[PDB]
């Protein structure tokens, strides 16, 4: 068609960060609008601010219990590097102390 | 390519509404008081 | 100095504020844009984050320092005085 202009899909037309769309062609040769949802951040380390490996960027409510866990004693709260320091620090301190 | 007629064109707010005690269009929607009956 | 004779980084101001202000800004801005040696790892990776906040791009250690420069002379004098007064007390308990 010679015109590809669309109309707003939301209750109002103000374009905030939760009102973003993309365009796709439908089976009836029509151009439609689809929401672009915000992607949440995955959990971040407590000691450092880096991201924790093994967990996807989805809200935890939509994940199974196994998919939001890491198999380590402090898994999901701190990284492997930060856990070594705590183990070394506690042992070396309690040996001298 | 004023303070009169052109400024009347910027009016699209409701200052008063209907009172629940007297029902008289004198309830201030931002003070939450009636200018007529005092509710 | 292929492009300017004397203005240096104060060339962003054109001709707009006078000579005294531009000279003082030259000194201060040169100081505040510089890279400083990290006191914890001896590398020149410390940069300013806010008025008195300095961060290392290697070890990621944050320090409280001066504005425009990591160290100030009054602070060095004070640290030396504290260190001296600390030893005299610990000899006699």
């Amino acid at each position: 068609m010679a015109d590809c202009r669309v109309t707003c899909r939301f209750h109002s037309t103000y374009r905030t960060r939760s009102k973003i769309v993309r365009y796709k062609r439908t089976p009836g040769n029509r151009l439609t609008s689809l929401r672009v949802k915000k992607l949440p951040n995955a959990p971040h380390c407590a000691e450092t601010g880096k991201q924790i490996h093994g967990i996807p960027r989805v809200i935890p409510q939509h994940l199974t219990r196994q998919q939001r866990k890491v198999s380590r004693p402090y898994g999901g709260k701190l990284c492997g590097s930060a856990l070594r320091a705590h183990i070394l620090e506690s042992f070396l301190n309690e040996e001298n102390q | 390519a004023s303070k009169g007629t052109a400024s009347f064109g910027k009016r699209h707010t409701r200052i008063h509404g209907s009172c629940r005690r007297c029902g008289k269009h004198s309830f201030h929607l931002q003070k939450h008081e009636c200018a007529s009956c005092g509710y | 100095a292929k492009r300017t004779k004397k203005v240096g980084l104060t060339g962003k101001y054109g001709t707009r504020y006078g000579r005294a202000a531009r000279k003082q800004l030259l000194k201060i801005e040169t100081s505040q844009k510089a890279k400083y040696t990290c006191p914890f790892c001896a590398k020149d990776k410390v940069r300013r984050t806010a008025c008195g906040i300095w961060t290392c791009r290697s070890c990621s250690k944050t320090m409280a320092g001066g504005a425009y420069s990591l160290h100030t002379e009054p602070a060095n004098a004070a640290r030396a005085t504290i260190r001296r007064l600390r030893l005299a007390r610990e000899d006699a308990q």
């Binding site: - | - | 008195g52 944050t62 420069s69 004070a78």
Partner: protein, 248 residues
């Protein structure tokens, strides 16, 4: 006439401090039994920027001594303090930069900051960026100690008042020109509504005692007495002298 600018400021309204997005009130740790006998250990967690303030603030975590868990404080950072450092407070704290201890145990000639005028008030004396106090002398008979304030005046305080070793971080801030009117605008937009400033001689008589006339000028002397009533106290209040003397 009508009410002057000074009279309108005191009633609040558009003259209140903008406090949105501020970390909180900076204070020394509260005084308790544990540090009235020994020392309490803490760890510096972060160094942050406070809106409106020129000096940085440090977040320090201490153990909880009346239960379980931890307690988060908010200090004014001395120069040289770094993230991950551990500090002590109490009668037995050691003489290091970040530590808090009573002034009676601090040797004469030391630099201190965030001093408290009266015991257990949590700091009030040297809190602006670059400032510091000096311990001058002790008097064991009366249990009072003399300090020197950043303004140069000398004061006596009780020997049980606490302070922090070092000087406040961020020194040198006022050595750089603001240069532009837009910079002063941002600086004062972080604090309160007080800028820009209109001169009194440029007003009409109805809204300032200095206004009016066929030339811009102050009619009378600008020195007003100490007992002038609120709408009169403009100019130089109870001035001992005027002008650029040049000597000490």
């Amino acid at each position: 006439g009508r009410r002057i600018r000074v009279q309108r400021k005191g009633a609040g309204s558009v003259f209140r401090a903008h406090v949105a997005r501020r970390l909180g009130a900076a204070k020394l740790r509260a005084n308790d039994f544990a540090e009235r006998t020994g020392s309490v250990r803490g760890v510096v967690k972060a160094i942050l920027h406070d809106r409106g303030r020129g000096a940085p603030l440090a977040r320090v975590q201490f153990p909880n001594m009346r239960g379980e868990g931890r307690v988060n404080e908010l200090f004014i950072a001395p120069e040289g303090m770094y993230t991950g450092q551990e500090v002590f407070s109490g009668n037995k704290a050691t003489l290091h930069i970040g530590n808090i201890l009573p002034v009676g145990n601090i040797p004469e000639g030391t630099y201190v900051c965030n001093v408290e005028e009266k015991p257990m008030d949590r700091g009030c004396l040297a809190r602006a960026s670059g400032t510091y106090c000096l311990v001058v002398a002790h008097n064991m008979e009366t249990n009072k100690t003399r300090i020197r304030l950043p303004s140069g005046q000398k004061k006596l305080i009780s020997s049980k008042a606490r302070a922090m070793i070092g000087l406040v971080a961020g020194g040198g801030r006022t050595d750089k020109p603001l240069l532009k009117a837009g910079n002063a605008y941002h600086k004062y937009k972080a604090k309160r509504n007080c800028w820009p400033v209109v001169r009194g001689v440029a007003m009409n008589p109805v809204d300032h005692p200095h206004g009016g006339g066929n030339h811009q000028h102050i009619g009378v002397s600008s020195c007003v007495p100490r007992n002038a009533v609120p709408g009169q106290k403009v100019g130089l209040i109870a001035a001992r002298r005027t002008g650029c003397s040049g000597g000490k």
